[PDB]
Amino acid sequence: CNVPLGMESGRIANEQISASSTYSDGRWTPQQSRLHGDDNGWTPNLDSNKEYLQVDLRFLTMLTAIATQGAISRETQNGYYVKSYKLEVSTNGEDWMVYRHGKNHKVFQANNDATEVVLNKLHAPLLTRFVRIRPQTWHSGIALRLELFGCRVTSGS
Ligand SMILES: [Cl-]
Ligand SMILES: [Cl-]
Ligand SMILES: [Zn+2]
Ligand SMILES: [Zn+2]
Ligand SMILES: [Zn+2]
């Protein structure tokens, strides 16, 4: 259950991608967070561990992996990247759960440069419709490009 879900391909439409905030110059929008995208990436308005990139998958989906990169600024050639993040999921867009192992939030180790893809496979598939990626640590600034992997599933109700 390991199919790219549509960040890089466009199957996830722009309207399905959103964020807590975006940098005030308009050059680092949520829609720039697609994996391998050639124009900057998503950056929030402020660098903090409360900001997030949100994706509505539209259907109930088994999430099995997350890929991330940072980005290089087109304007300055400086590199920005997330070093670790949490994941927060919801089937309805209202009830949000920060993904945990037992009582500990799972902290995914992410990038150590602006260009290489780091892939985190989940230990077991996770049911969700909405995904938030919530940077906890970063280098120089938050910047993200993303892919999500998994499969559509049938709800048991
Ligand atoms: Cl590719
Ligand atoms: Cl995991
Ligand atoms: Zn690619
Ligand atoms: Zn409600
Ligand atoms: Zn896990």
Which ligand has its closest atom nearest to the C-alpha of 35?
Answer: 3
CA nearest 108: which of 56, 53, 67?
67
Which 3-state string (H, E, C) describes 44-109? CCCCCCCCCEEEEEEEEEEEEEEEEECEECCCCCCEEEEEEEEEEEECCCCCCEECEECCEECCEE
Is the Cβ–Cβ distance between 64 and 148 less than 8 Å? Answer: no
Distance CA 20, CA 7 (A): 18
CA nearest 149: which of 122, 130, 123?
122
- Which residues line ion ligand 4, judged by CB < 5 Å? 94
Q: What angle do CA 17, 10, 50 make, to 5 degrees?
A: 20
What's the CA-to-centroid distance between 36 and ligand 1, angstroms?
7
What's the CA-to-centroid distance between 142 and ligand 5, angstroms?
24
**Sequence ranges of the domains in the chain:** 1-157
Please state the CATH superfamily assignment of the domain spanning residues 1-157 in this structure.
Galactose-binding domain-like (2.60.120.260)
> What method was applied to determine this entry?
X-ray
Resolution (A): 1.8
What's the CA-to-centroid distance between 45 and ligand 4, angstroms?
28
Is the Cβ–Cβ distance between 10 and 157 less than 8 Å? Answer: no
